[PDB]
Structure formats: structure tokens, C-alpha cells
Design a protein around this ligand. Structure first.
Ligand SMILES: O=c1ccn([C@@H]2O[C@H](COP(=O)(O)OP(=O)(O)O)[C@@H](O)[C@H]2O)c(=O)[nH]1
Ligand SMILES: O=C(CCc1ccc(O)cc1)c1c(O)cc(O)cc1O
Length: 454
């Protein structure tokens, strides 16, 4: 009535660390913020470990030319862990690029693996600053609680159960603890010890989760039950898959299969089974009798792939799969969300990386959990507690045992024959939509955050 002005711009800077499991939720968060009319600066540590990260970033930036990319050129062990440490070690060199941002920065959201080097930088900027935690809220509870465990003089040798008050997995046995945390000199063990005590300095923690799958962990974190004085935890999931991620023979094959008849199999973007274990997967898929879409990795890093899929699988397995005409096997980057959203896919053999879990939740696809490393056993039990997936506790971390094709096929048939899992997965899918609708946890949290930043 008394002013005609360019309405103020909320400017968010984002900093993702290594791996598709970190880039993907940051770019989906970016898309959400852009839809709330934020200006977004994206800091891109270069070069990326994997080609998939490289190509996704390119597709994102061409989909959103309004995004301001800040190049973060890194100086020249698990290759993604090595990148985590390099980004961390070079982070103190981001201050001049963040200080010079225009329009004025409103908030700063950085990767949970970068807390210690970035915290003083964020405090220098004088804006609300946050981590985006890319794993489950239950895993975040474990992360927050870790200094309480590691203070013990019998850590890590004497620790049989981790029972965090009020969370979605009330008892985490030692066999589900991320294995590096039980080795007394690992990168993540040191990161946990240096970073978790500094959580209280953040303005908040964003998590790609929602009440439909982690109601208890969300309530425990925000009620002071996990660690007193933790910053507010915002359930801003489910992160809905976005158009820019798409890159047509797979979808054409899925178009030919009966509804719900295909078992999708993938163990993420950075994990490769051993050769013998990999071939047992194929044996189990054939033995299951179900149609399957099996995504194979022979190397951790896609750039390192060097053997043809026929040689990886071997003559005998290839021969059985081509003869029965029930499965499709690919050693390439697929559009996992396009696949999970296809009516033909009725189940998901997943390593239970958190992004894959929440995608399965979004599409209501029941899970056969096969956790392999890291946070995956905790995530598998978050799913199983909700009754929309199952996992076999005795299969153990990848490389500890050889899971045979007979028991893989039995587990696949068990999950695909279980209609109670579909019922619960469909209610999760219903709640996934509630979370992003007006009044849902994600809509409420984003409006809170936007109002603080304004
Ligand atoms: O061929 C592939 C493999 C993976 N993904 C996606 O890559 C991410 C994997 O992240 P997650 O946290 O599930 O596991 P991680 O890859 O970090 O082990 C998810 O968004 C999957 O949809 C994909 O689109 N195509
Ligand atoms: O322990 C965690 C929890 C996430 C996490 C990793 C690093 C960090 O600095 C903070 C939180 C973990 C691993 O240990 C190993 C993994 O393959 C994945 C994974 O999710």
C-alpha cells in the first residue's frame, strides 16, 4: 500500500559431500527450496568420485540455470571415504567464496560429514546454519549418542547393545553397529568423535524422513530424549524424485511385465559384491521363479568398471537367465526411481541405503533388506519395525559369509508372497504423501525454516 519493492530473496547455500547418496538428497532439497522461491548457491567439490555424480550435477544445473554454482576445486582406502577427507581437509578454503555471496546469504546447509571444518566458517557468515543428514533419523540418533558410548574405557571391545531412549529401533545390537566404529582408528570413528559433540552449535538438523516411517526417532530427538540440548530435527522427507535426474529399453521391458510381477535388485551407487557372492544372487533370482531387474556393480566406483557383464556373471548363470526369459540384468546407471515407480515392480531387494529406502517408501514398494555395510543394518530394522520389509539378521555384513542362492531365492519368495508387507508399504506410501501435504511434517518444517530465514 505504501511500497512497491522487489520482495526479499531467501538465499540458501548448499554443500554436498561425496557419493550419489549425498548428492541426490542435496539436489532434491535444492529443488524443494527453488519451489519455495529461494535463491540457491550450490558448492560443488570437483572432481567427483563417480561419473554418475558428474552427470547428475550437469543435468541439475541445466534444469535450473538460476542456481549459482560455486566451484570447489579439490587438490589431487575406500574412494568415497578418501573424498570425504579431502573435502574436509580443503574446506577452510571456502570462506572467501561464501563471504562474497550476493544477494545476502540467508542460511547455510552443509553435509553432515563436514561439521568440524565448516562450523567456524558458518559462524563467521552470521546466518542460521544446518547439516543435511543423509541417513535415517534413527542413525542420526546413534550418531548423536556416540560420544556417550565412546567415553567408556571398555569401548569398543565391550558394547553389546545400544538402547537409545524412545527411538524407532529400541535395541541396536553390536552386530548392527557400523563396522568402522568398532575399529579404534578409523576415519568415521574420528569423525564421529570430533563432530557429534559439536551438534549443539547448529541451528538445526534436516533429515530426509517422515513420521510414517520413523515417528519414534523423530519424537525422541525433538523431546530431549536422545541427547539434551540437541538442535531441532526437521523431518523434511520424503524427498520426491525430480525430473532432472532422468537420463528406453528398461522401461519398455517393464511395460511388458504383469503388474507387481518384477523384483528390482540394487545395492546402491558405491557397493560391489564379491564375485562369488554376486553369482549367488543370480542363482537365487533364478531359483525364486520371479521376474527380476538386477542392477550389478563389479566395482565400487563406476569409473573403474572394466569387465563385461557376461564375464562377471559367468557362462552358467548367464545361460540360465537368458533361457528362462524372466530377468533383465544391467551393469549401468539406471533411473532407480523410474523403476520403483513402475507398476510392474512389486518388490525391492535393497541394501537399505537410506535414499533407496525413502524412494521405496514413496512408491510403496515392500523391501527384502540385504544390508551390506555402514548404516544399512540399522536402516533395515527401521523398515522391518514398520512392517513393510524384512531382512535376514544372519546373512551378516558383506564378505563375512557366503549367502547361498537357495536361501536368497527362499527369502525373495517369502517377501513376494507376503501381502501384509504390501498393506503396510501402501500405508507408508499414503503417509509419505501426508508428510508433504499442507499440515504434514515436511510442509510444517519448511515453513518454519523459511520464516526463520526471512
Ligand atoms: O543404478 C543406480 C543406483 C543407484 N541409484 C540411486 O542412487 C541412490 C543410492 O543412495 P543410497 O543412500 O540408497 O545408497 P548409497 O548409494 O549411498 O550406498 C538412490 O537415490 C538410488 O535411487 C540410481 O538411481 N541408479
Ligand atoms: O556411520 C554411518 C552413519 C552416517 C555418517 C557417516 C559419516 C559421518 O561423518 C557422519 C554420519 C555410516 C558409516 O559409518 C558407513 C557407511 O558406509 C554409511 C554410513 O551411513
Amino acid at each position: 500500500m505504501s511500497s512497491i519493492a522487489p520482495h526479499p530473496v531467501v538465499h540458501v547455500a548448499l554443500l554436498p559431500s561425496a557419493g550419489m547418496g549425498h548428492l541426490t538428497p542435496f539436489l532434491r532439497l535444492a529443488s524443494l527450496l527453488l519451489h519455495q522461491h529461494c535463491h540457491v548457491t550450490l558448492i560443488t567439490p570437483q572432481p567427483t568420485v563417480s561419473k554418475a555424480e558428474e552427470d547428475l550435477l550437469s543435468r541439475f544445473l541445466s534444469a535450473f540455470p538460476q542456481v549459482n554454482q560455486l566451484h570447489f576445486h579439490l587438490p589431487p582406502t575406500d574412494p568415497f571415504f578418501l573424498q570425504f577427507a579431502s573435502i574436509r581437509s580443503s574446506s577452510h578454503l571456502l570462506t572467501p567464496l561464501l563471504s562474497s555471496l550476493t544477494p545476502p546469504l540467508s542460511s547455510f546447509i552443509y553435509d553432515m560429514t563436514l561439521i568440524s571444518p565448516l562450523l567456524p566458517i558458518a559462524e563467521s557468515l552470521g546466518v542460521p546454519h544446518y547439516i543435511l543428514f543423509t541417513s535415517s533419523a534413527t542413525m542420526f540418533s546413534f550418531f548423536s549418542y556416540f560420544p556417550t558410548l565412546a567415553k567408556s574405557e571398555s569401548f569398543p571391545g565391550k558394547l553389546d547393545f545400544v538402547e537409545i531412549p524412545g527411538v524407532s529401533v529400541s535395541s541396536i545390537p553390536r552386530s548392527s553397529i557400523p563396522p568402522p566404529l568398532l575399529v579404534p582408528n578409523s576415519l568415521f570413528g574420528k569423525l564421529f568423535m570430533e563432530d557429534s559433540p559439536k551438534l549443539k552449535k547448529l541451528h538445526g538438523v534436516l533429515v530426509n524422513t517422515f513420521e510414517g516411517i520413523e515417528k519414534l526417532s523423530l519424537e525422541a530427538l525433538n523431546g530431549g530424549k536422545v541427547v539434551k540440548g540437541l538442535p531441532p530435527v526437521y523431518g523434511v522427507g520424503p524427498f520426491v524424485p525430480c525430473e532432472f535426474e532422468k537420463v528406453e529399453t528398461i522401461s519398455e521391458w517393464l511395460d511388458e511385465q504383469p503388474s507387481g510381477s518384477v523384483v528390482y535388485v540394487s545395492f546402491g551407487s558405491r557397493t560391489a559384491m564379491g564375485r562369488e557372492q554376486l553369482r549367488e544372487v543370480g542363482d537365487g533370482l533364478v531359483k525364486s521363479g520371479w521376474r527380476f531387474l538386477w542392477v550389478v556393480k563389479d566395482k565400487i566406483v563406476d569409473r573403474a568398471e572394466e569387465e563385461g557383464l557376461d564375464g562377471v556373471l559367468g557362462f552358467e548363470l548367464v545361460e540360465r537367465m537368458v533361457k528362462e526369459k524372466k530377468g533383465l540384468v544391467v551393469k549401468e546407471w539406471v533411473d532407480q526411481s523410474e523403476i520403483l515407480g513402475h507398476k510392474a515392480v512389486g518388490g525391492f531387494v535393497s541394501h537399505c541405503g537410506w535414499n533407496s529406502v525413502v524412494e521405496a517408501a514413496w512408491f510403496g514398494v515392500k523391501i527384502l533388506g540385504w544390508p551390506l555395510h555402514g548404516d544399512q543394518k540399522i536402516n533395515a530394522e527401521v523398515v522391518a519395525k514398520g512392517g513393510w520389509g524384512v531382512w535376514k539378521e544372519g546373512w551378516d555384513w558383506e564378505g563375512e559369509r557366503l549367502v547361498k542362492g537357495e536361501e536368497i531365492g527362499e527369502a525373495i519368495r517369502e517377501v513376494m508372497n507376503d501381502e501384509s508387507l504390501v498393506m503396510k508399504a501402501t500405508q507408508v506410501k499414503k503417509d509419505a504423501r501426508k508428510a508433504i501435504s499442507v499440515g504434514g511434517g515436511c510442509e510444517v518444517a519448511l515453513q518454519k525454516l523459511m520464516e526463520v530465514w526471512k
